[PDB]
Structure formats: structure tokens, C-alpha cells
């Protein structure tokens, strides 16, 4: 992927359902994003390489 | 025999949490899991300038 917000390499999946949902990302206690948003409008949660 | 089996019975029931040895065991699994994953999370993302 290459989101406007950040670079990265991930495997998106239609996951559920944890986030903020109005700003787009979700992190897990580090710099990484685990990981949905951005798609319109669904939960494409990402993973590491 | 019933006192031996009673002793082993309380040895069955009691692991968590106030019964170190067991907190030593999770001090070990949390030790090497902490060192591995958490130190490797400090090593990457982020260190540098």
C-alpha cells in the first residue's frame, strides 16, 4: 500500500471493528499501524510483511 | 495416603497467583518474551535521529 498519511507494506483484510472511525488510522502502542483505513468505507486491517 | 493425596490436591488447586514458584515461571516466560519481543520493539520503531 501507499496511503497519503504513511508508506508501508501490508496484507489488508476485512477485519472488525476497533478504531476511531473519523480520523482514519489505528496504531497499536508503537509507530506501526494495525491498520485499517483507508478505504471507503471498510475495515482493511493491515499486517506486517 | 489421604493426607498425601490431600497435599497433592492443594498442589493441584494452587498455581495462581500468590504461589511463586509460579510467578517465577511467568517471570521466566515474561522474561524471555519481554526481552525478545519487547526489546526488539525498542530496537526497531524507533531508535535513530
Amino acid at each position: 500500500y501507499s496511503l497519503y498519511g504513511v508508506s508501508g507494506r501490508g496484507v489488508f483484510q476485512n477485519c472488525t471493528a476497533v478504531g476511531v472511525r473519523q480520523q482514519r488510522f489505528v496504531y497499536d502502542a508503537y509507530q506501526n499501524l494495525v491498520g485499517y483505513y483507508s478505504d471507503d468505507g471498510n475495515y482493511y486491517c493491515l499486517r506486517a510483511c | 495416603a489421604n493426607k498425601f493425596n490431600q497435599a497433592l490436591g492443594a498442589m493441584q488447586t494452587g498455581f495462581t497467583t500468590t504461589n511463586e514458584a509460579f510467578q517465577k515461571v511467568q517471570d521466566a516466560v515474561n522474561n524471555n518474551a519481554q526481552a525478545l519481543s519487547k526489546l526488539a520493539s525498542e530496537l526497531s520503531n524507533t531508535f535513530g535521529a
Binding site: 476511531v20 472511525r21 473519523q22 480520523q23 | -
Partner: protein, 49 residues
């Protein structure tokens, strides 16, 4: 200048999220509260939070 509110994203819980960035680039150093008074008649008087 960034404005935040709980209204749009967390109406029932209170977390604040950004809803505007105002093109005000002169640094704000001062503020005051503008007093409002409600021109009710005596029989229409309410208490305001």
C-alpha cells in the same frame, strides 16, 4: 487555530476530536469570555448551565 469537540465523533462519551483548522497564523496570546445575557421577560426566565 484548531477547534475540537466531542459532538460529532463521541457525543455520548466526551472524547474531543478536531473539527476545524482556522487560518489564523498570528499567534494567539490572549483570550476572554464574551458575556451573554438572555433578554427574557420575567415569566420566561431560565437557569443556564
Amino acid at each position: 487555530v484548531h477547534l475540537f469537540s466531542s459532538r460529532y465523533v463521541d457525543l455520548y462519551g466526551g472524547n474531543m476530536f478536531q473539527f476545524a483548522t482556522l487560518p489564523v497564523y498570528d499567534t494567539i496570546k490572549y483570550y476572554s469570555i464574551i458575556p451573554h445575557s438572555i433578554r427574557s421577560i420575567q415569566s420566561d426566565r431560565k437557569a443556564w448551565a
